[PDB]
């Protein structure tokens, strides 16, 4: 089983590499066969290649990310509240999702899912 | 598809019903083939009576339950950050979970999963 300590560190490392625009940093956290469904309802991004590629796009503007509450972690899974802030064409946006990782035996994230809807997308 | 509003209202009712010790009200929100895994990693409670028994065991003590953040809802799923507090023999506990609902076509909750661990709990 994974330790809550380890899952909580991965979540903190994820947030910090997004802030640093550290693509490798983000890719290394996932299993080779990991899936990402971000947002929930959208077509899943499968395998290292697709996931990196997704993250590059999401890194095309500068992001400011913050965990807005304690990480929750138990049984190989973790969830966390946070925000991602960015600016485009003079318009500031703040997205507030809840994300959920599942972790495999090796401590890598095999599944990521991002739940947030239009009502969790705010102005600056 | 469910609307985000319907699911956000369901979360709101779920929370009001826990506060009011309204057992019938909680169970009504559920599909009668619904499952409930509280906490993530325990064996699920499957179907209405099992589920009803779960909630009657929760309501053995009075609960104070409050949302601590905006609800997240998109494509038939919702997730929410909240605290549940109770007191037993002068001793106060505070659990800070993140729950996740999936819904069916009829607007009913088909699964709840409550993700928290010992780091999300304070007894004192």
A57: helix, strand or coil: helix
Taking an 8 Å cut-off on Cβ atoms, the answer to whether A79 and B100 are in contact is yes
- Nearest 10 degrees: Cα torsion B32, B35, B39, B40: -160
How many CB atoms lie under 10 A from the CB of residue A34? 22
How was this one solved?
X-ray
Taking an 8 Å cut-off on Cβ atoms, the answer to whether B77 and A117 are in contact is no
Taking an 8 Å cut-off on Cβ atoms, the answer to whether A78 and B115 are in contact is yes
CA–CA separation, A80 and B108 (whole Å): 25
Task: Please count the structural domains in chain A.
Answer: 1
* B14 annotated active-site: yes
- In chain A, the residue whose alpha carbon lies closest to the alpha carbon of B80 is A98
* A14 annotated active-site: yes
* B33 in a known ligand binding site: no
DSSP type of residue B124: -
- In chain A, the residue whose alpha carbon lies closest to the alpha carbon of B116 is A72
For A96, the domain range is 1-124
Interior angle at CA A10, CA A124 and CA B72, nearest 5: 40
Buried b (16+ CB within 10 A) or exposed e, A87-118: eeeeeeeebbbbbbbbbeeeebbbbbbbbbbe
Cβ pair A68, A15 in contact under 8 A: no
B109: helix, strand or coil: strand
- In chain B, the residue whose alpha carbon lies closest to the alpha carbon of A81 is B81
Q: Which residues on chain B place their C-beta less than 8 Å from a C-beta of chain A?
A: 4, 8, 39-41, 68-70, 72-81, 96-98, 100, 115-120
Interior angle at CA A96, CA A98 and CA A107, nearest 5: 35
**Phi and psi dihedrals of A112, rounded to 5?**
-130, 135
Q: What is the CATH number of the domain that holds A52?
A: 3.10.450.50
């Amino acid at each position: 089983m994974n330790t809550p300590e380890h899952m909580t560190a991965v979540v903190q490392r994820y947030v910090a590499a997004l802030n640093a625009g550290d693509l490798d940093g983000i890719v290394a956290l996932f299993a080779d066969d990991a899936t990402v469904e971000d947002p929930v309802g959208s077509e899943p991004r499968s395998g290292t290649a697709a996931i990196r590629e997704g993250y590059a796009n999401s890194l095309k503007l500068p992001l400011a990310v913050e965990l807005t509450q304690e990480v929750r972690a138990v049984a190989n899974e973790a969830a966390f509240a946070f925000t991602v802030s960015f600016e485009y064409q003079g318009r500031k946006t703040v997205v507030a999702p809840i994300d959920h990782f599942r972790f495999n035996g090796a401590g890598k994230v095999v599944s990521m899912r991002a739940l947030f809807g239009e009502k969790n997308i705010h102005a600056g």
